Amino acid sequence: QENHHVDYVIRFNYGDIDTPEAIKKFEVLLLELSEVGLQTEVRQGDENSLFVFVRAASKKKLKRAVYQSRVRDWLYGVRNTEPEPASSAKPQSEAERLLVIYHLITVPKAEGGAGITPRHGEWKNVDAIFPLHDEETNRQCMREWSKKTFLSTEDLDRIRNTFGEHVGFYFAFLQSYFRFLMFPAAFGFSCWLLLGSFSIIYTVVNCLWCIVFIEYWKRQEEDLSCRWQTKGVSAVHEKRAEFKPEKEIRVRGVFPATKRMYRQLLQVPFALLAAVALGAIIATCFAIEIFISEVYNGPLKGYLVFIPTILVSALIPTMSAVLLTVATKLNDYENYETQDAYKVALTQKIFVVNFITSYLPIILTAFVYVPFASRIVPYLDFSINPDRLRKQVIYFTVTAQIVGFALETIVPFVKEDEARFLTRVRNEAELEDYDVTDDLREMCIQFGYLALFSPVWPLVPVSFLINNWVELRSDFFKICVECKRPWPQRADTIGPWLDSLGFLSWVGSITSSALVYMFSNGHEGPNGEPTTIRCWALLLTIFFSEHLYLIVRYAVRSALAKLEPPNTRRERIERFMMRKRYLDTVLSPTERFWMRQRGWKESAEVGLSLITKAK
Amino acid sequence: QENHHVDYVIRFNYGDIDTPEAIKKFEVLLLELSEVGLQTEVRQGDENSLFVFVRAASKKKLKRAVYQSRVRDWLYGVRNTEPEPASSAKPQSEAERLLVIYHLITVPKAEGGAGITPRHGEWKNVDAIFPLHDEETNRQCMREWSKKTFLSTEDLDRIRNTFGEHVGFYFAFLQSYFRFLMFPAAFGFSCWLLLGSFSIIYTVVNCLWCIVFIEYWKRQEEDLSCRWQTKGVSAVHEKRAEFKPEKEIRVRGVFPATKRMYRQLLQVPFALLAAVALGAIIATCFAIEIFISEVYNGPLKGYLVFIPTILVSALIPTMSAVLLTVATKLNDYENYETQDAYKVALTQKIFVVNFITSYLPIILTAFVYVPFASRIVPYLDFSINPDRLRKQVIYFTVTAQIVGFALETIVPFVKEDEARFLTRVRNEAELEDYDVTDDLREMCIQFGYLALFSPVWPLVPVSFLINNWVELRSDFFKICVECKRPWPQRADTIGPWLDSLGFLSWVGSITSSALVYMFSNGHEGPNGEPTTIRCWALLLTIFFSEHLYLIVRYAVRSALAKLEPPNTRRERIERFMMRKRYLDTVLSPTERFWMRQRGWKESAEVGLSLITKAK
Ligand SMILES: [Ca+2]
Ligand SMILES: [Ca+2]
Ligand SMILES: [Ca+2]
Ligand SMILES: [Ca+2]
Secondary structure: OOOOOOOEEEEEEOOOOOHHHHHHHHHHHHHHHHHOOEEEEEOOOOOOEEEEEEEEOOHHHHHHHHHHHHHHHHHOOOOOOOOOOHHHOOOOOHHHHHHHHHHHHHOOOOOOOOOOOOOOOOOOOEEEEEEOOOHHHHHHHHHHOOOOOOOOHHHHHHHHHHHOHHHHHHHHHHHHHHHHOHHHHHHHHHHHHOOOOOOHHHHHHHHHHHHHHHHHHHHHHHHHHHHHOOOOHHHHOOEOOOOOOOOOOOOOOOOOHHHHHHHHHHHHHHHHHHHHHHHHHHHHHHHHHHHHHHHOOOOOOOOOOHHHHHHHHOOHHHHHHHHHHHHHHHHHHOOOOEHHHHHHHHHHHHHHHHHHHHHHHHHHHHHHHOOOOOOOOOOOOOOOOOOHHHHHHHHHHHHHHHHHHHHHHHHHHHOOOHHHHHHHHHHHOOOEOOOHHHHHHHHHHHHHHHHHHOOOOOOHHHHHHHHHHHHHHHHHHHHHHOEOOOOOOOOOOOOOHHHHHHHHHHHHHHHHHHHHHHOOOOOOOOOOOHHHOOHHHHHHHHHHHHHHHHHHHHHHHHHHHOOOOHHHHHHHHHHHHHHHHHHHHOOOOHHHHOOOOOOHHHHHHHHHHHHHHOO | OOOOOOOEEEEEEOOOOOHHHHHHHHHHHHHHHHHOOEEEEEOOOOOOEEEEEEEEOOHHHHHHHHHHHHHHHHHOOOOOOOOOOHHHOOOOOHHHHHHHHHHHHHOOOOOOOOOOOOOOOOOOOEEEEEEOOOHHHHHHHHHHOOOOOOOOHHHHHHHHHHHOHHHHHHHHHHHHHHHHOHHHHHHHHHHHHOOOOOOHHHHHHHHHHHHHHHHHHHHHHHHHHHHHOOOOHHHHOOEOOOOOOOOOOOOOOOOOHHHHHHHHHHHHHHHHHHHHHHHHHHHHHHHHHHHHHHHOOOOOOOOOOHHHHHHHHOOHHHHHHHHHHHHHHHHHHOOOOEHHHHHHHHHHHHHHHHHHHHHHHHHHHHHHHOOOOOOOOOOOOOOOOOOHHHHHHHHHHHHHHHHHHHHHHHHHHHOOOHHHHHHHHHHHOOOEOOOHHHHHHHHHHHHHHHHHHOOOOOOHHHHHHHHHHHHHHHHHHHHHHOEOOOOOOOOOOOOOHHHHHHHHHHHHHHHHHHHHHHOOOOOOOOOOOHHHOOHHHHHHHHHHHHHHHHHHHHHHHHHHHOOOOHHHHHHHHHHHHHHHHHHHHOOOOHHHHOOOOOOHHHHHHHHHHHHHHOO
C-alpha cells in the first residue's frame, strides 16, 4: 500500500514546552482523538516534534461518520438527493474519506469531533495536520497528461477525488481559460501579422472575448458545483476558532452583521494607505529610471542603470509585507464566523496591493510618460523612447512568465520495515503548505494584462496560451512534489476572483480604448507633448467604448441565463423528485339562486331557450 | 351575502355565431365545467351574450382542489412547508379560493382543469372570466385609509387576500415609494429655499437617494415574497395557449431556447424603428414650436401657438398604437411558453416607446435648445427663453400629474329577488379590464423625472409626495369601482420595472451631472451658444459622477446583502426543518504499523518516553 492506511499526520511540537506541560497536553490530544473514533500511532517527528498518525478505528465507525456527513449536507440543501443508509455508506473517493476524517479531528466537541485547532488557542503546539501523498497516483497522472493538449472531464474529476473541489476548481478554471485563449491567440497572431499594434479591430474582439469568457465561466461554475455536489456549500462552512461572539443564543454565538459593517469601513482608509504607500515607491523609482536612462548624459551609465530595478525589488516586497500585516490585523478586527469568509475578505484586501504592484508600472508608462514627459523632464533635473511602452508589455507578459516559472516551481524544488516510510513522512512534513489562492491570483493577474494592455503588442495571448499549458502541468507537479498534500477542502466557485476578472475586464475596456486612440497615429503616439491629444475626444472614445462594453456584457449575460446547463437542470429536477418521495411515503335566500338548474343538462337547455329566443 | 356564493362569471358570446354552432359549443362549455367539479347557473348577459355563473360544486371537491394546489406549490419549491392534509384544507383567503377556481376553469385538460382559454382557439366566443367585487369590503377599506398617512402591514395584506399578490405588490411598492419620497421632498424643499436650482448638494443627495430606494426595494421584494409564499412562483407559471412547441417530449412540448434567441434579435431593429419614428415626430414638432414661439414675429401668434401641442397629441398616440401593433406581432413571433414571459417581454418592448415619449421632450430642451439654438435658428427659417427648461419640468411633474389624475380616474368613471343582483352583474361586466402594469408604468416613469431632471426645480419630489398619497387612494378606487375585479394572479416582484428603475437611476446620474455643470452659472446656462461649454470638462464631470454612482451603488448593494430580512431567514430555516422531518420519519505488512500501541494510553506513554528523552 505504501501509505499504511494513514489518514492524517498530526505534528506535535514540544520545543517551547516543558515536559510536565508537554505530556499534559499530549494526553488530551490522544484521548480526544480516541473518543471521536480514531486510531493513533505515535512516532518521532523531528529533533523537537512528535507527530501522531491517525486512522479510522473501524469500518463501522467510519461508515457512520461518512453517513452523518452526507446527512449534514442533505439537511442544509447542499446534496438534494437523500443520503443512502449508513449500512452501505462507503466513501465515494479518497477526498471524501479524508474530508470526513479531517472534520472529526478539527470541528469542536459540541459539533461532533475533537476540537483540535492547530496552533490557535489550546493546540498551539499542534503545528500541522496533513494527509499523505498517494505517490503513484500522483506520478501516473503527471505523465499521463504531459502528452495531451486537454485534460478530460475524467482527468478533472480525478483531481478533485484526490485534492478536493477547491483545488479541482482551480484546474477546471485554468483549463477552461486555456481553451478560450486559443481564440485571441489565433486572432492576436493574425492582427499582429496583417495589422499592427493598437488596432481597432483587435481591441474590440479582445474586449468581446473577455466578456464571453467571464460569462461562460460564471455559468460553468454553477454547472460544475452541481456536478460535484458542492452547490450551496457555503451553508455548511467550517467556523473558525478565532471568532468572538457578542451574545450566545441557541447555541450559536451571534455577532451582529451591522457591527461588523462598521469595522469593514476601515478598508477605505487601508486601500488608500496602500495606494499612497506603493504608488509613491513605484512612481518615484520610475521617475529615477527615466532620469538616468533618457536624461542623465554622463558616465557610469553602464552600471548605474540597475539602481531602480534593484531598489524596487527590495522596496515593493518590503512594503507588501507591511501591508499584508496591516490587512491581517484589520481582517482579524472584523470577526468572520467562518474560515471562508475570513479568507475571502483577506484576498480582497490584498487584491488592492496586487492591482497596484502589477499594473501601475505599465499605467505610468502609457499614460504619464508618453503623453507627458516633455513637460516633466524640465522639472526632473526630450524625445521619449518610442519603444519603452512595448518593451515593458513584453517584459511583463513574456519575461515575467518565464522568470516566474523558475521561482515558482524550480527554485522551491532545488531548495526496519517502517523506516523507509517514516523517512519520507519526515520529508513530506518539511515541504510547503500549498495555497490555491496564490495560483488563482497569478492567473487572474495574468488575465488583467490581456484585458488592459494587449493592444500594445497583440502577441500577448500567444504567450499566455503557451504559458498556461505548461502552467497546468507545473502547478500539478508543484502540488504533488513540493507541497504537503492539501486536505480536500470543498468549494462551489473560484471565489472572489470571479469578480476581479469582471472588474479587470471593465477597466480594460477603458484603458484599451484610451490606448487605441492616443496611438492611432503609431506606437509613438504623442511624442511626449500632450498637445495633440484632444481631451474631449479621448473622453468621448472612453464614454462610448465603456458603455458599449456594459451593453454587450448585459446582452451576453442575459442570453446565457436562458440556457440552463444540464447538471444544473438535474439538481432542480432532483429536488422535485425528492419532495415527491416525501409526499408519497409520508403525507399520503341565496341558495334559491342555485337550486334552479340542477344538472349540466338543465343549464344546457336553459341556454338553448335563450340563445334561440335572442336571434 | 350579496354575492350569492358566485366565484366567477363566464361571459359567452353568440353575436357572431349561428344557433347550431352556438349551442354546440355551449354544451361543451357546460360539461367541461361539470367534469372538473364546478356548479353552473346560466342567465342572460346582454342582447348578444349569455354568461354562466360558476361555483365549487361541493366543499369536498373544493378542499381537494385547494389541497392539490398547495401540493403543486410545495413540490416546485414555492411553499417550503408541508401542505396540511386535504381533510382540513380550507382556503387561507378569498384570493386563494378564487385562484384555485380560476385554475380549474382555464388550465388544460391534461393538467387537471377545463381548458377554457377565453377567445383564443376554441373558446373564441368566451369573452371574459371575471370574479365579482366584494362591495362592502371594498367600501370599508376605501374609507378606512382615506384618513391615514400610511397603510399598515395588515392593510397591505388585506389587498392581496382580495386581489392577489400581483396587485398587492404594486400597492406595497407604491407605499414604500411614497414613504421614501419624504426624504427628497423635505430635502428638496430645503435646497429650493436656501440654495436654488442645479445645486451640487441637491444632485448628490438625489442620486444617493435613488440608489438606496432601489436597493431597499429589491430586498423588500424578496422579504415580501417570502411572507406571501410566492417566492419562487415562476416555477409554476401558467402556460399560454398560443405556445407552439417544435418537438413534444415527456409530455412537455419543447421549443429550443436558442431558436427563440435569434428571433429576439429583432428587438434591436424594433427599438431603432421606434426611436426614429417617435423621435422624428417629437423633434420636428419641437422645432416648429420654437419657430412660432421665439422666431416668428408676425401676427396670428395668439391662435397659431397651439398647433404643435395639438399636432403631437394626435401624432404620438397614433404612432404609439402603430408601434404597439408591431411590438405585439414581434412578441407573438417569439414563442413564450408562459403568460408571464409573454407579458414581461411585451412590457420591455414598450418601455422603449415610453422612455422616448416621456423624456425626449425635456432632453431636447436641456441639451439641444439651451446649448445650441443660437446656431440652429439661422437655419430654422437669438436670445433663448431662459425659463423654457424650468416651465417644462413643471408641466411634466405638476400639470401632468394633475391632468393625468383626471383622465385616469374621473373621466373613466363619468363615461324578483335575483333581479337586483343580476342587474349589477351586467354593470360589472361592462367595466374595464384592470392591468396593474399600466399603474406600475406610470409610477416608474414618474420616478424617471425625479432621477433625470429634478435638479431643475428641486420641488419635484414634493409634487410626487403629494401625488403619490392621492394615487394610492385613487388607484384603489379605480380597481373597486371602474374595473372588473382582477383574478388573484400571483407574483414575487413588480417584474421588469425593477430593472427600469435601476436603468433610470444610472441614466439620471449622467444627465443630472451634465445639468449641474452647464447651469452652474444660473438657470440660463449657455444662452444659446455652445462656446462657453468646455467639452472636456462636461465629459470629465460625467465620467466621475457616473463612476461614483456605480461605486456607491455597489457598496450599498453589498451592505444590504449582508442583512438578511426576517421573512427570508424564516424560509431558509423552514426548508431545513422540512428535511429534518423527512429524515426523522423516513430515512431513520502495513497492519504491523498499527498493532504497535493498542490503546490511547500506550501512545501516551510512548510519547512520554520520547518527549523526555529528547530534552
Ligand atoms: Ca507561473
Ligand atoms: Ca501558478
Ligand atoms: Ca396618476
Ligand atoms: Ca396609477
